[PDB]
Amino acid sequence: GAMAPSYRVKRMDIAKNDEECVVNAANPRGLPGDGVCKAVYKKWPESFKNSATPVGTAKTVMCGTYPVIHAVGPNFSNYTESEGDRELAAAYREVAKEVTRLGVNSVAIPLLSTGVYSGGKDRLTQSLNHLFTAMDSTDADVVIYCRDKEWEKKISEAIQMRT
């Protein structure tokens, strides 16, 4: 575990993280995809061997000894708000189980379902609150990765608010 488990946010490519493992915002078919998933494919292509997994689940594949946790958030284009919210919560619960099983002291994590799976809606608060619900009981240092300057400020404020 980390000595004083923390949350932090950084505005940079998650493929350049400084943590002991990475969460990929994956598609269910294990395809290279785009956004986070394509950066993750370029950096850790060996981790896409048998990475296909259903919506609401996470599947870990090693790249060398570096764990890539493929977490499949719902595409809100296809899911109802209600079912999508349930599957987004579930994907983060499965990430917490994997992070725990792996025994890592730190994890790099993107906000699931906030990009091309957002169904055109701002889901910063929805996705971050599900991330907190899952990860609060883990003792890994969590480093959240984003690309937008205004998102960085809002994520930082939400972390600081809980103290």
Binding residues for ADP-D-ribose: 13, 27, 35, 115-117
Calpha distance 161→86 (Å, rounded): 25
Contacts of 162 (CB under 8 A, 6+ apart): 132
Q: Is 146 in the site for Cl ion (CB under 5 A)?
A: yes
Q: Is 148 in the site for Cl ion (CB under 5 A)?
A: yes
Q: Report in angstroms how near the CB of residue 105 gets to Cl ion at its nearest.
A: 23
Among 12, 38, 45, 157, binds Cl ion (CB under 5 A): 12
Q: Is 18 in the site for Cl ion (CB under 5 A)?
A: no
Q: Report in angstroms how near the CB of residue 102 gets to Cl ion at its nearest.
A: 23
Q: Total number of residues binding Cl ion (CB under 5 A)? A: 8
Calpha distance 102→124 (Å, rounded): 27
3-state secondary structure string across 65-86: CEEEEEECCCCCCCCCHHHHHH
